[PDB]
PDB file of C-alpha atoms (C1' of nucleotides) in Angstrom:
ATOM      1  CA  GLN A   1      -0.181   0.006   0.285  1.00 41.29           C
ATOM      2  CA  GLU A   2       2.855   2.607   0.954  1.00 41.56           C
ATOM      3  CA  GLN A   3       4.520   1.775  -2.068  1.00 41.00           C
ATOM      4  CA  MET A   4       1.383   2.988  -4.156  1.00 43.24           C
ATOM      5  CA  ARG A   5       1.133   6.002  -2.211  1.00 47.18           C
ATOM      6  CA  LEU A   6       4.782   6.866  -3.258  1.00 48.86           C
ATOM      7  CA  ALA A   7       4.042   6.122  -6.729  1.00 52.05           C
ATOM      8  CA  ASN A   8       0.832   7.763  -6.901  1.00 52.26           C
ATOM      9  CA  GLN A   9       2.416  11.298  -5.575  1.00 50.43           C
ATOM     10  CA  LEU A  10       4.988  10.736  -8.057  1.00 47.28           C
ATOM     11  CA  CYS A  11       2.974  10.312 -11.328  1.00 50.44           C
ATOM     12  CA  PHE A  12       1.289  13.645  -9.730  1.00 53.49           C
ATOM     13  CA  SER A  13       4.245  15.511  -8.667  1.00 48.02           C
ATOM     14  CA  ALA A  14       5.840  14.973 -12.130  1.00 44.55           C
ATOM     15  CA  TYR A  15       2.662  15.782 -13.819  1.00 43.23           C
ATOM     16  CA  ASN A  16       2.439  19.006 -12.089  1.00 44.86           C
ATOM     17  CA  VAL A  17       6.103  19.992 -13.096  1.00 43.51           C
ATOM     18  CA  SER A  18       6.063  19.179 -17.084  1.00 44.25           C
ATOM     19  CA  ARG A  19       2.378  21.196 -16.933  1.00 45.05           C
ATOM     20  CA  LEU A  20       4.299  24.222 -15.102  1.00 44.50           C
ATOM     21  CA  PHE A  21       7.333  24.387 -17.414  1.00 43.73           C
ATOM     22  CA  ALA A  22       5.003  23.894 -20.311  1.00 42.30           C
ATOM     23  CA  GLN A  23       3.200  27.157 -19.042  1.00 45.56           C
ATOM     24  CA  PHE A  24       6.199  29.031 -18.009  1.00 47.82           C
ATOM     25  CA  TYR A  25       7.547  28.580 -21.673  1.00 50.57           C
ATOM     26  CA  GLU A  26       4.442  29.215 -23.428  1.00 50.10           C
ATOM     27  CA  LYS A  27       4.117  32.770 -21.899  1.00 47.91           C
ATOM     28  CA  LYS A  28       7.631  33.603 -23.108  1.00 45.49           C
ATOM     29  CA  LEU A  29       7.021  31.981 -26.822  1.00 45.09           C
ATOM     30  CA  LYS A  30       3.574  33.484 -27.268  1.00 45.34           C
ATOM     31  CA  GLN A  31       5.317  36.517 -29.229  1.00 46.59           C
ATOM     32  CA  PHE A  32       6.964  34.377 -31.309  1.00 51.51           C
ATOM     33  CA  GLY A  33       3.948  32.697 -32.585  1.00 52.49           C
ATOM     34  CA  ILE A  34       4.868  28.850 -31.431  1.00 50.56           C
ATOM     35  CA  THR A  35       4.048  26.597 -28.910  1.00 54.44           C
ATOM     36  CA  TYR A  36       6.444  24.720 -26.595  1.00 55.49           C
ATOM     37  CA  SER A  37       6.222  21.294 -28.443  1.00 54.74           C
ATOM     38  CA  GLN A  38       7.414  23.323 -31.444  1.00 55.72           C
ATOM     39  CA  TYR A  39      10.223  24.945 -29.532  1.00 55.23           C
ATOM     40  CA  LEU A  40      11.490  21.511 -28.837  1.00 56.88           C
ATOM     41  CA  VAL A  41      11.651  20.581 -32.109  1.00 57.65           C
ATOM     42  CA  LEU A  42      13.434  23.531 -32.947  1.00 57.91           C
ATOM     43  CA  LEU A  43      15.867  23.123 -30.256  1.00 59.59           C
ATOM     44  CA  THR A  44      16.817  19.631 -32.345  1.00 58.89           C
ATOM     45  CA  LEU A  45      17.049  21.647 -35.466  1.00 56.63           C
ATOM     46  CA  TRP A  46      19.301  24.172 -33.918  1.00 53.50           C
ATOM     47  CA  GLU A  47      21.789  21.716 -32.994  1.00 53.77           C
ATOM     48  CA  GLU A  48      21.296  19.593 -36.138  1.00 47.33           C
ATOM     49  CA  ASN A  49      20.064  20.749 -39.323  1.00 45.34           C
ATOM     50  CA  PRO A  50      18.587  19.593 -41.714  1.00 45.01           C
ATOM     51  CA  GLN A  51      16.824  16.239 -40.283  1.00 40.54           C
ATOM     52  CA  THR A  52      14.412  13.814 -41.163  1.00 40.66           C
ATOM     53  CA  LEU A  53      11.207  13.933 -39.433  1.00 39.52           C
ATOM     54  CA  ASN A  54      11.899  10.392 -38.579  1.00 38.24           C
ATOM     55  CA  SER A  55      15.115  11.402 -36.930  1.00 36.69           C
ATOM     56  CA  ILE A  56      13.432  14.354 -34.872  1.00 35.14           C
ATOM     57  CA  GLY A  57      11.025  11.716 -33.376  1.00 36.93           C
ATOM     58  CA  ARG A  58      13.972   9.798 -32.177  1.00 36.70           C
ATOM     59  CA  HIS A  59      15.533  12.753 -30.626  1.00 31.16           C
ATOM     60  CA  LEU A  60      12.174  13.406 -28.866  1.00 36.50           C
ATOM     61  CA  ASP A  61      10.305  10.066 -28.289  1.00 35.09           C
ATOM     62  CA  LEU A  62       7.737  11.054 -30.932  1.00 35.28           C
ATOM     63  CA  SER A  63       6.370   9.850 -34.063  1.00 36.68           C
ATOM     64  CA  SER A  64       4.418  10.826 -37.373  1.00 36.17           C
ATOM     65  CA  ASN A  65       1.019  10.878 -35.348  1.00 31.59           C
ATOM     66  CA  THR A  66       2.301  14.061 -33.433  1.00 32.42           C
ATOM     67  CA  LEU A  67       5.203  15.237 -35.946  1.00 32.41           C
ATOM     68  CA  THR A  68       3.306  15.301 -39.215  1.00 31.87           C
ATOM     69  CA  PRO A  69       0.584  18.086 -38.625  1.00 31.81           C
ATOM     70  CA  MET A  70       2.910  19.886 -36.316  1.00 34.71           C
ATOM     71  CA  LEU A  71       5.949  20.515 -38.728  1.00 34.56           C
ATOM     72  CA  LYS A  72       3.094  21.662 -40.838  1.00 37.47           C
ATOM     73  CA  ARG A  73       2.427  24.546 -38.650  1.00 40.62           C
ATOM     74  CA  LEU A  74       6.086  25.330 -38.363  1.00 40.86           C
ATOM     75  CA  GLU A  75       6.068  25.490 -42.034  1.00 40.61           C
ATOM     76  CA  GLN A  76       3.300  27.714 -42.617  1.00 40.20           C
ATOM     77  CA  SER A  77       4.557  29.864 -39.735  1.00 40.22           C
ATOM     78  CA  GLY A  78       7.860  30.339 -41.537  1.00 43.64           C
ATOM     79  CA  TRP A  79      10.256  28.502 -39.300  1.00 43.27           C
ATOM     80  CA  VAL A  80      10.965  25.175 -41.540  1.00 45.43           C
ATOM     81  CA  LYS A  81      10.867  23.819 -45.121  1.00 45.81           C
ATOM     82  CA  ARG A  82       9.204  20.115 -45.555  1.00 47.32           C
ATOM     83  CA  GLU A  83      10.477  18.653 -48.828  1.00 49.38           C
ATOM     84  CA  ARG A  84      10.865  15.097 -49.766  1.00 48.56           C
ATOM     85  CA  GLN A  85      14.225  13.114 -50.343  1.00 52.05           C
ATOM     86  CA  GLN A  86      14.950  12.128 -54.126  1.00 49.24           C
ATOM     87  CA  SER A  87      17.083   9.444 -53.046  1.00 50.71           C
ATOM     88  CA  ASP A  88      14.018   7.650 -51.079  1.00 52.98           C
ATOM     89  CA  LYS A  89      10.504   9.364 -51.857  1.00 53.48           C
ATOM     90  CA  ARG A  90       8.875   7.955 -48.545  1.00 50.05           C
ATOM     91  CA  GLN A  91      11.358  10.006 -46.213  1.00 46.91           C
ATOM     92  CA  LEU A  92      10.521  13.688 -45.296  1.00 47.85           C
ATOM     93  CA  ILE A  93      13.508  16.250 -44.706  1.00 49.33           C
ATOM     94  CA  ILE A  94      13.134  19.071 -42.345  1.00 53.47           C
ATOM     95  CA  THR A  95      15.002  22.074 -43.202  1.00 52.93           C
ATOM     96  CA  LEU A  96      15.308  25.323 -41.156  1.00 53.67           C
ATOM     97  CA  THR A  97      14.800  28.556 -43.447  1.00 54.71           C
ATOM     98  CA  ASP A  98      16.980  31.505 -42.712  1.00 56.54           C
ATOM     99  CA  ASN A  99      14.416  33.261 -40.799  1.00 56.62           C
ATOM    100  CA  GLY A 100      13.749  30.158 -38.655  1.00 57.65           C
ATOM    101  CA  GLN A 101      17.765  29.625 -37.952  1.00 58.42           C
ATOM    102  CA  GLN A 102      18.238  33.488 -37.529  1.00 61.27           C
ATOM    103  CA  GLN A 103      15.758  33.736 -34.634  1.00 63.18           C
ATOM    104  CA  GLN A 104      17.331  31.568 -32.099  1.00 63.43           C
ATOM    105  CA  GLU A 105      19.373  34.002 -30.475  1.00 62.90           C
ATOM    106  CA  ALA A 106      15.958  36.332 -29.988  1.00 64.12           C
ATOM    107  CA  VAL A 107      14.156  33.228 -28.772  1.00 64.86           C
ATOM    108  CA  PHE A 108      16.629  31.991 -26.323  1.00 66.25           C
ATOM    109  CA  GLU A 109      17.085  35.858 -24.933  1.00 68.68           C
ATOM    110  CA  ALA A 110      13.175  36.012 -23.943  1.00 70.39           C
ATOM    111  CA  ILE A 111      13.444  32.811 -22.385  1.00 70.50           C
ATOM    112  CA  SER A 112      16.809  33.422 -20.634  1.00 68.17           C
ATOM    113  CA  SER A 113      15.645  36.674 -19.024  1.00 67.81           C
ATOM    114  CA  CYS A 114      13.316  35.303 -17.017  1.00 64.25           C
ATOM    115  CA  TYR A 115      19.820  21.997  -9.404  1.00 64.03           C
ATOM    116  CA  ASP A 116      23.062  20.117 -10.161  1.00 63.94           C
ATOM    117  CA  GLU A 117      21.932  16.745  -8.663  1.00 64.88           C
ATOM    118  CA  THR A 118      18.243  17.162  -9.682  1.00 66.71           C
ATOM    119  CA  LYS A 119      18.896  16.367 -13.349  1.00 62.86           C
ATOM    120  CA  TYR A 120      20.609  13.071 -12.517  1.00 63.00           C
ATOM    121  CA  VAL A 121      17.348  12.141 -10.524  1.00 65.39           C
ATOM    122  CA  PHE A 122      14.646  12.796 -13.331  1.00 62.66           C
ATOM    123  CA  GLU A 123      17.437  11.222 -15.754  1.00 60.91           C
ATOM    124  CA  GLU A 124      17.237   7.905 -13.942  1.00 60.30           C
ATOM    125  CA  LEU A 125      13.731   7.972 -13.170  1.00 58.78           C
ATOM    126  CA  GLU A 126      13.350   8.293 -16.890  1.00 60.77           C
ATOM    127  CA  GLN A 127      15.023   5.133 -17.361  1.00 60.49           C
ATOM    128  CA  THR A 128      13.398   3.310 -14.714  1.00 62.27           C
ATOM    129  CA  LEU A 129       9.983   3.892 -16.334  1.00 64.62           C
ATOM    130  CA  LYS A 130      11.088   3.267 -20.058  1.00 65.98           C
ATOM    131  CA  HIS A 131      12.463  -0.352 -18.745  1.00 67.57           C
ATOM    132  CA  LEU A 132       8.673  -0.716 -16.900  1.00 68.76           C
ATOM    133  CA  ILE A 133       6.753   0.023 -19.864  1.00 69.28           C
ATOM    134  CA  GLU A 134       8.762  -1.830 -22.702  1.00 70.54           C
ATOM    135  CA  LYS A 135       8.802  -6.102 -21.969  1.00 69.87           C
TER     136      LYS A 135
ATOM    137  CA  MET C   1      27.523  32.357 -19.133  1.00 70.71           C
ATOM    138  CA  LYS C   2      23.783  32.741 -19.292  1.00 68.03           C
ATOM    139  CA  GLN C   3      23.956  30.459 -22.240  1.00 71.31           C
ATOM    140  CA  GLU C   4      24.926  27.670 -19.748  1.00 69.66           C
ATOM    141  CA  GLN C   5      21.736  28.494 -17.464  1.00 71.23           C
ATOM    142  CA  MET C   6      19.493  27.875 -20.523  1.00 73.70           C
ATOM    143  CA  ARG C   7      20.724  24.464 -21.530  1.00 73.71           C
ATOM    144  CA  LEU C   8      20.020  23.660 -17.714  1.00 76.84           C
ATOM    145  CA  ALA C   9      16.399  24.742 -18.127  1.00 72.92           C
ATOM    146  CA  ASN C  10      16.037  23.180 -21.617  1.00 66.98           C
ATOM    147  CA  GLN C  11      17.380  19.737 -20.163  1.00 67.88           C
ATOM    148  CA  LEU C  12      14.905  20.148 -17.335  1.00 65.93           C
ATOM    149  CA  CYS C  13      11.460  21.056 -19.391  1.00 64.82           C
ATOM    150  CA  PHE C  14      12.459  18.037 -21.670  1.00 66.48           C
ATOM    151  CA  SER C  15      13.446  15.619 -18.785  1.00 68.63           C
ATOM    152  CA  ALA C  16      10.250  16.414 -17.077  1.00 70.19           C
ATOM    153  CA  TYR C  17       8.267  16.384 -20.336  1.00 70.11           C
ATOM    154  CA  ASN C  18       9.691  12.653 -20.935  1.00 67.59           C
ATOM    155  CA  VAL C  19       9.103  11.569 -17.050  1.00 65.95           C
ATOM    156  CA  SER C  20       5.317  12.843 -17.165  1.00 68.14           C
ATOM    157  CA  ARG C  21       4.575  11.161 -20.357  1.00 69.12           C
ATOM    158  CA  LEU C  22       6.119   7.869 -19.357  1.00 69.68           C
ATOM    159  CA  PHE C  23       4.099   7.639 -16.151  1.00 70.11           C
ATOM    160  CA  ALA C  24       0.762   8.499 -18.282  1.00 68.17           C
ATOM    161  CA  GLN C  25       1.552   5.536 -20.553  1.00 69.50           C
ATOM    162  CA  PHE C  26       2.508   3.082 -17.717  1.00 72.47           C
ATOM    163  CA  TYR C  27      -0.893   4.185 -15.674  1.00 74.92           C
ATOM    164  CA  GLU C  28      -3.200   4.061 -18.751  1.00 76.60           C
ATOM    165  CA  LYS C  29      -1.639   0.460 -19.764  1.00 82.45           C
ATOM    166  CA  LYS C  30      -3.008  -0.596 -16.077  1.00 84.23           C
ATOM    167  CA  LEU C  31      -5.946   1.659 -16.316  1.00 83.79           C
ATOM    168  CA  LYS C  32      -7.371   0.228 -19.627  1.00 84.05           C
ATOM    169  CA  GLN C  33      -9.198  -2.693 -18.304  1.00 84.91           C
ATOM    170  CA  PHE C  34     -11.462  -0.363 -15.990  1.00 87.23           C
ATOM    171  CA  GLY C  35     -11.968   1.976 -18.949  1.00 90.66           C
ATOM    172  CA  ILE C  36     -10.669   5.067 -17.473  1.00 86.61           C
ATOM    173  CA  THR C  37      -7.834   7.132 -18.250  1.00 88.41           C
ATOM    174  CA  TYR C  38      -5.057   8.622 -15.854  1.00 90.56           C
ATOM    175  CA  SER C  39      -6.624  12.058 -15.713  1.00 89.75           C
ATOM    176  CA  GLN C  40      -9.772  10.477 -14.297  1.00 87.16           C
ATOM    177  CA  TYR C  41      -7.646   8.352 -12.370  1.00 89.69           C
ATOM    178  CA  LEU C  42      -6.405  11.395 -10.596  1.00 89.35           C
ATOM    179  CA  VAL C  43      -9.811  12.976 -10.148  1.00 89.73           C
ATOM    180  CA  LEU C  44     -10.615   9.436  -8.506  1.00 90.68           C
ATOM    181  CA  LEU C  45      -7.733   9.952  -6.077  1.00 92.67           C
ATOM    182  CA  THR C  46      -8.924  13.034  -4.720  1.00 92.68           C
ATOM    183  CA  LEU C  47     -12.550  11.528  -4.210  1.00 91.75           C
ATOM    184  CA  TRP C  48     -11.371   8.534  -2.837  1.00 91.76           C
ATOM    185  CA  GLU C  49      -9.779  10.768  -0.033  1.00 92.30           C
ATOM    186  CA  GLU C  50     -12.819  13.212   0.094  1.00 92.41           C
ATOM    187  CA  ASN C  51     -16.108  12.426  -0.790  1.00 93.71           C
ATOM    188  CA  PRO C  52     -17.898  14.407  -1.889  1.00 94.82           C
ATOM    189  CA  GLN C  53     -16.636  17.432  -3.415  1.00 96.58           C
ATOM    190  CA  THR C  54     -17.374  20.179  -5.583  1.00 94.24           C
ATOM    191  CA  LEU C  55     -15.828  20.559  -9.177  1.00 95.72           C
ATOM    192  CA  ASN C  56     -14.113  23.567  -7.763  1.00 96.55           C
ATOM    193  CA  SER C  57     -12.535  21.722  -4.984  1.00 97.97           C
ATOM    194  CA  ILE C  58     -11.128  18.882  -7.084  1.00 97.42           C
ATOM    195  CA  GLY C  59      -9.974  21.595  -9.425  1.00 97.40           C
ATOM    196  CA  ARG C  60      -7.948  23.243  -6.598  1.00 99.21           C
ATOM    197  CA  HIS C  61      -6.454  19.633  -5.741  1.00 97.50           C
ATOM    198  CA  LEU C  62      -5.126  19.214  -8.939  1.00 95.45           C
ATOM    199  CA  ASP C  63      -4.909  22.645 -10.443  1.00 94.03           C
ATOM    200  CA  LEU C  64      -7.442  22.390 -13.145  1.00 95.50           C
ATOM    201  CA  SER C  65     -10.328  23.932 -13.942  1.00 93.00           C
ATOM    202  CA  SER C  66     -13.555  23.315 -15.344  1.00 97.17           C
ATOM    203  CA  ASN C  67     -12.464  23.557 -18.920  1.00 93.93           C
ATOM    204  CA  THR C  68     -11.047  20.492 -18.546  1.00 94.42           C
ATOM    205  CA  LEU C  69     -13.115  18.721 -15.446  1.00 90.50           C
ATOM    206  CA  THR C  70     -16.458  19.658 -16.918  1.00 87.65           C
ATOM    207  CA  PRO C  71     -16.184  17.409 -20.065  1.00 88.18           C
ATOM    208  CA  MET C  72     -14.406  14.733 -18.104  1.00 84.60           C
ATOM    209  CA  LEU C  73     -16.607  14.271 -15.140  1.00 82.85           C
ATOM    210  CA  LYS C  74     -19.245  13.697 -17.679  1.00 82.26           C
ATOM    211  CA  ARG C  75     -17.236  11.031 -18.764  1.00 82.17           C
ATOM    212  CA  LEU C  76     -16.846   9.427 -15.467  1.00 78.29           C
ATOM    213  CA  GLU C  77     -20.417  10.059 -15.011  1.00 78.04           C
ATOM    214  CA  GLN C  78     -21.369   7.944 -17.991  1.00 78.81           C
ATOM    215  CA  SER C  79     -19.083   5.190 -16.861  1.00 78.82           C
ATOM    216  CA  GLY C  80     -20.758   4.864 -13.482  1.00 77.17           C
ATOM    217  CA  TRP C  81     -18.150   6.153 -11.557  1.00 77.57           C
ATOM    218  CA  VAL C  82     -19.521   9.539 -10.311  1.00 77.10           C
ATOM    219  CA  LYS C  83     -22.577  11.465  -9.707  1.00 75.99           C
ATOM    220  CA  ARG C  84     -22.744  14.743 -10.814  1.00 75.24           C
ATOM    221  CA  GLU C  85     -25.561  16.973  -9.180  1.00 72.87           C
ATOM    222  CA  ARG C  86     -26.627  20.550  -8.758  1.00 70.75           C
ATOM    223  CA  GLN C  87     -26.500  22.260  -5.108  1.00 67.93           C
ATOM    224  CA  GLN C  88     -29.839  23.012  -3.923  1.00 64.09           C
ATOM    225  CA  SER C  89     -28.286  25.505  -1.378  1.00 65.25           C
ATOM    226  CA  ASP C  90     -26.389  27.275  -4.289  1.00 66.95           C
ATOM    227  CA  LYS C  91     -27.306  26.367  -8.100  1.00 64.24           C
ATOM    228  CA  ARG C  92     -24.138  27.702  -9.517  1.00 64.56           C
ATOM    229  CA  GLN C  93     -22.073  24.768  -7.731  1.00 64.43           C
ATOM    230  CA  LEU C  94     -21.760  21.075  -9.256  1.00 66.34           C
ATOM    231  CA  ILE C  95     -21.258  18.300  -6.413  1.00 67.88           C
ATOM    232  CA  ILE C  96     -19.606  15.439  -7.381  1.00 70.19           C
ATOM    233  CA  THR C  97     -20.001  11.989  -5.554  1.00 71.61           C
ATOM    234  CA  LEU C  98     -18.684   8.779  -5.703  1.00 69.50           C
ATOM    235  CA  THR C  99     -21.380   5.715  -6.699  1.00 69.64           C
ATOM    236  CA  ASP C 100     -21.090   2.387  -4.835  1.00 72.83           C
ATOM    237  CA  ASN C 101     -19.238   1.131  -7.514  1.00 71.11           C
ATOM    238  CA  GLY C 102     -17.229   4.047  -7.768  1.00 72.59           C
ATOM    239  CA  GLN C 103     -16.017   3.727  -4.102  1.00 77.28           C
ATOM    240  CA  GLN C 104     -15.841   0.156  -4.080  1.00 78.76           C
ATOM    241  CA  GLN C 105     -13.594  -0.452  -7.142  1.00 77.00           C
ATOM    242  CA  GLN C 106     -10.533   1.503  -5.626  1.00 78.45           C
ATOM    243  CA  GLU C 107      -9.014  -1.823  -4.017  1.00 76.53           C
ATOM    244  CA  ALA C 108      -9.449  -3.479  -7.603  1.00 75.88           C
ATOM    245  CA  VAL C 109      -7.594  -0.360  -9.352  1.00 77.89           C
ATOM    246  CA  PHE C 110      -5.050  -0.081  -6.767  1.00 76.69           C
ATOM    247  CA  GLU C 111      -4.249  -3.781  -6.869  1.00 79.04           C
ATOM    248  CA  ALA C 112      -3.645  -3.559 -10.707  1.00 83.31           C
ATOM    249  CA  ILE C 113      -1.230  -0.651 -10.478  1.00 79.59           C
ATOM    250  CA  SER C 114       0.630  -2.047  -7.406  1.00 78.95           C
ATOM    251  CA  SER C 115       1.280  -5.275  -8.732  1.00 76.87           C
ATOM    252  CA  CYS C 116       3.333  -3.979 -11.600  1.00 79.62           C
ATOM    253  CA  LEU C 117       5.801  -1.543  -9.799  1.00 80.83           C
ATOM    254  CA  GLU C 118      15.205   5.082  -1.972  1.00 77.87           C
ATOM    255  CA  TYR C 119      12.669   6.683  -4.483  1.00 79.14           C
ATOM    256  CA  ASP C 120      11.577   8.274  -1.553  1.00 78.56           C
ATOM    257  CA  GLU C 121      14.693  11.061  -1.583  1.00 77.51           C
ATOM    258  CA  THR C 122      13.104  11.592  -5.361  1.00 73.48           C
ATOM    259  CA  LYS C 123       9.630  13.010  -4.402  1.00 72.23           C
ATOM    260  CA  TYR C 124      11.629  15.730  -2.237  1.00 75.84           C
ATOM    261  CA  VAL C 125      13.188  16.944  -5.479  1.00 75.31           C
ATOM    262  CA  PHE C 126      10.283  17.046  -7.287  1.00 75.35           C
ATOM    263  CA  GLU C 127       8.193  18.616  -4.692  1.00 74.12           C
ATOM    264  CA  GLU C 128      10.853  21.340  -4.509  1.00 72.13           C
ATOM    265  CA  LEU C 129      11.096  22.233  -8.422  1.00 71.19           C
ATOM    266  CA  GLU C 130       7.348  22.345  -8.471  1.00 70.96           C
ATOM    267  CA  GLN C 131       7.179  24.985  -5.756  1.00 70.27           C
ATOM    268  CA  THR C 132      10.291  26.893  -7.292  1.00 68.61           C
ATOM    269  CA  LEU C 133       8.199  26.970 -10.537  1.00 68.33           C
ATOM    270  CA  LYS C 134       4.922  28.071  -8.736  1.00 67.79           C
ATOM    271  CA  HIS C 135       6.467  31.286  -7.601  1.00 67.25           C
ATOM    272  CA  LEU C 136       8.221  31.640 -10.905  1.00 62.93           C
ATOM    273  CA  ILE C 137       5.221  31.761 -12.819  1.00 60.78           C
ATOM    274  CA  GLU C 138       3.561  34.549 -10.475  1.00 63.08           C
TER     275      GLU C 138
ATOM    276  C1'  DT O   1       4.532 -10.971 -56.206  1.00 61.33           C
ATOM    277  C1'  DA O   2       6.025  -9.942 -51.330  1.00 60.07           C
ATOM    278  C1'  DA O   3       8.020  -7.977 -47.072  1.00 61.46           C
ATOM    279  C1'  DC O   4       9.161  -4.008 -45.030  1.00 60.11           C
ATOM    280  C1'  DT O   5       9.551   1.024 -43.678  1.00 61.07           C
ATOM    281  C1'  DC O   6       8.074   5.517 -44.093  1.00 59.63           C
ATOM    282  C1'  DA O   7       4.787  10.099 -43.263  1.00 58.14           C
ATOM    283  C1'  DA O   8       0.119  10.284 -43.029  1.00 61.88           C
ATOM    284  C1'  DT O   9      -4.302   9.781 -41.514  1.00 61.03           C
ATOM    285  C1'  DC O  10      -8.061   8.492 -38.033  1.00 61.27           C
ATOM    286  C1'  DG O  11     -10.269   9.168 -32.962  1.00 63.23           C
ATOM    287  C1'  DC O  12     -10.477  10.716 -28.829  1.00 64.43           C
ATOM    288  C1'  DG O  13      -9.206  12.941 -24.711  1.00 65.17           C
ATOM    289  C1'  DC O  14      -6.898  16.016 -22.552  1.00 67.21           C
ATOM    290  C1'  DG O  15      -4.763  20.966 -20.818  1.00 66.80           C
ATOM    291  C1'  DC O  16      -5.308  25.684 -20.987  1.00 67.97           C
ATOM    292  C1'  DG O  17      -6.542  30.717 -22.513  1.00 67.68           C
ATOM    293  C1'  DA O  18     -10.429  32.745 -23.400  1.00 66.18           C
ATOM    294  C1'  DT O  19     -15.375  33.911 -23.258  1.00 66.28           C
ATOM    295  C1'  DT O  20     -20.608  32.974 -22.015  1.00 64.53           C
ATOM    296  C1'  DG O  21     -24.426  33.017 -19.217  1.00 65.86           C
ATOM    297  C1'  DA O  22     -26.914  31.474 -15.451  1.00 65.81           C
ATOM    298  C1'  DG O  23     -27.335  32.339 -10.757  1.00 63.59           C
ATOM    299  C1'  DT O  24     -26.095  34.956  -5.947  1.00 66.49           C
TER     300       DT O  24
ATOM    301  C1'  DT Y   1     -29.214  48.263 -12.256  1.00 67.17           C
ATOM    302  C1'  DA Y   2     -24.200  46.609 -10.529  1.00 65.28           C
ATOM    303  C1'  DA Y   3     -20.335  43.436  -8.824  1.00 62.87           C
ATOM    304  C1'  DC Y   4     -19.455  38.680  -8.348  1.00 61.35           C
ATOM    305  C1'  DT Y   5     -18.500  33.697  -8.681  1.00 61.33           C
ATOM    306  C1'  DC Y   6     -19.565  29.413 -10.550  1.00 61.59           C
ATOM    307  C1'  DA Y   7     -19.786  25.458 -14.096  1.00 61.42           C
ATOM    308  C1'  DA Y   8     -20.155  25.313 -19.251  1.00 58.53           C
ATOM    309  C1'  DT Y   9     -18.657  26.286 -23.755  1.00 58.12           C
ATOM    310  C1'  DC Y  10     -15.120  27.404 -27.641  1.00 57.02           C
ATOM    311  C1'  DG Y  11     -11.026  26.969 -30.479  1.00 59.18           C
ATOM    312  C1'  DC Y  12      -6.940  24.785 -30.709  1.00 58.82           C
ATOM    313  C1'  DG Y  13      -2.679  21.959 -30.284  1.00 58.21           C
ATOM    314  C1'  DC Y  14      -1.070  18.073 -28.792  1.00 56.40           C
ATOM    315  C1'  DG Y  15       0.043  12.844 -27.569  1.00 55.79           C
ATOM    316  C1'  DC Y  16      -0.945   8.275 -28.904  1.00 58.21           C
ATOM    317  C1'  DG Y  17      -2.872   3.723 -30.142  1.00 57.46           C
ATOM    318  C1'  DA Y  18      -4.202   2.649 -34.305  1.00 59.34           C
ATOM    319  C1'  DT Y  19      -4.629   2.117 -39.463  1.00 57.11           C
ATOM    320  C1'  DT Y  20      -3.828   3.539 -44.144  1.00 53.86           C
ATOM    321  C1'  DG Y  21      -1.652   4.336 -48.665  1.00 51.71           C
ATOM    322  C1'  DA Y  22       2.555   5.423 -51.061  1.00 49.91           C
ATOM    323  C1'  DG Y  23       7.044   4.132 -51.915  1.00 50.55           C
ATOM    324  C1'  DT Y  24      11.221   0.470 -52.212  1.00 51.45           C
TER     325       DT Y  24
END
DNA sequence: TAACTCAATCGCGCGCGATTGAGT
DNA sequence: TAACTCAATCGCGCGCGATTGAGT
């Protein structure tokens, strides 16, 4: 029973924390016209560009069920280019525009202008949950 | 130097983003058989501690509001877990009450979750970050 | 021909900023 | 008439189990 009461106040605690972060980021990002999930996508591109949809998904643990309609929105909003690979026409290559590439500094400033062992505790629970789900 | 602090905040959005997802995945897997979602399970946890309650009260406990809870208490009512009824005293208010079935099924649910499960130190680190972030938003 | 691997699509339930309109 | 406080509603963007259909 007590091991349940521990598990329950961890779903709940992690459930609050990700919501509050998401709130905090969307507050600052509102002015650029992008969401936090789009921001995450843009963080992966800012590190490695171009990338395939599949590659971005692997970085974020997401798939095309999320990333297909969401890269579209980033394209419509001028941050990225979606185009088919000639080499393999099933694949989809996501490339930053110049405007997408350029605004990184502006975005990072907006966020920045508004805990050493914590990160370890998350990264470990992340791992513990990943084995509990799979197999 | 500011850039290093950003990288830290980015790999915490992301790390808590992954952890919340995985827990939801885990609790949906186990709760599938009872025909409830994890968010409904959360609502049910507060009723199991205190019943009845108003929609507003539940929302205070989970930091949610009617925009989420209104359509979601309707699903739990349709599924037989709760009653939704107007307060005679104050007809703006909406009182949530567990059914017998919703009350009685607690043990069954907990068992289903329990049987698939030092980590107390961890709970303190989350609770604190929660509290840092709450003040950061206001 | 088939097996395989992709993004795209479908259905649903959140979360949440914002607004509405009933009720006190 | 007003101020105030509720659940309900609206619109949108996720997340994700599941399926589809184009391409290799």
